[PDB]
């Protein structure tokens, strides 16, 4: 019984544009899109949480709260699975999917609630590592690259 | 099957190994395609034994071990890996691999002898 409501909801997802200029998902060709990019990121220094969280809080505005997590010195490789990477008018963009969203049923999912969810689930480090991986990928692939 | 291809471009990049250890001796004998096994067709080759290659008694590259049970085998292997980690100061356990003929038969014994070590003796597996 959920099928005829789900597909129109899917079209409601597809009709909604997701860009600063108003670019929808239907304008993306098959060669422009890339789904589930798996990347390995090396690190040769011992990853100190105190030297990293301060560097994040120096530039990221969402790190006003969020007291820093504690983890051991991790030296080696880091795995990651980006959901979607797509280019448009000569500019690359990243897209990830979060779909739990149990606590909201009304229209209260504004930018403040999404920022609070990003600060609670700590997706800022994941998005920063995704930006670092995409920057390294576009530097290795495309010659004469600017961030 | 590779040599039978007509339009194949064959490139060779072989790094020679200097034969000093026993394992390096075996790899050099395999790479250079030579027969170092002395059959001894005559009595002069059978009497003398200095025509072979000298093997140092401290060369612990290739060792063969006889055990009595799957528990005691990996219990000896853990102590030998600890001795190898103590012998070389720059040695990573990531660079050490252990391959078994049957994983399901030895894996209980491996987990048992690898979990029982204290904090100064424990290596990650």
């Amino acid at each position: 019984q959920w099928e005829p409501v789900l597909t129109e909801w899917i079209t409601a997802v597809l009709q909604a544009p997701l860009n600063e200029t108003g670019v929808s998902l239907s304008q993306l060709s098959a060669r422009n899109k890339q789904v589930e990019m798996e990347f390995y990121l090396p690190i040769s220094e011992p990853l100190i949480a105190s030297q990293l969280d301060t560097l994040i809080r120096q530039f990221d505005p969402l790190s006003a709260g969020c007291p820093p997590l504690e983890f051991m010195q991790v030296r080696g490789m880091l795995k990651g699975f980006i959901d979607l990477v797509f280019r448009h008018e000569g500019r690359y963009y990243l897209l990830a999917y979060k779909s739990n969203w149990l606590g909201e049923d009304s229209s209260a999912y504004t930018q403040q609630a999404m920022a609070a969810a990003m600060q609670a689930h700590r997706y800022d480090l994941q998005y920063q590592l995704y930006t670092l991986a995409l920057h390294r990928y576009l530097r290795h692939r495309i010659a004469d690259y600017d961030y | 099957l590779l040599s039978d291809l007509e339009s194949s471009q064959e490139l060779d990049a072989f790094v020679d190994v200097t034969p000093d250890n026993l394992l390096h001796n075996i790899q050099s004998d395999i790479l250079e395609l030579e027969n170092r096994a002395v059959a001894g067709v005559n009595i002069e080759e059978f009497s003398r034994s200095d025509n072979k290659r000298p093997l140092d008694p401290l060369d612990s590259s290739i060792t063969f071990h006889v055990c009595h049970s799957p528990q005691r085998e990996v219990e000896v292997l853990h102590d030998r890996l600890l001795a190898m980690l103590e012998e070389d100061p720059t040695l990573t356990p990531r660079d050490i691999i252990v391959m078994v003929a049957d994983i399901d038969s030895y894996s209980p014994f491996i987990q048992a002898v690898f979990g029982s070590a204290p904090a100064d003796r424990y290596l990650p597996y």
Binding site: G80, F81, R122 | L82, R94
Partner: peptide
């Protein structure tokens, strides 16, 4: 006769692990 056991001087290995974002959270 008297017999003793050898003792390891240092730790066997550093914290080397190939993890993901969920491992750091």
């Amino acid at each position: 006769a008297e017999l003793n056991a050898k003792t390891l001087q240092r730790l066997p290995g550093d914290n080397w692990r190939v993890t993901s974002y969920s491992g750091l959270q």
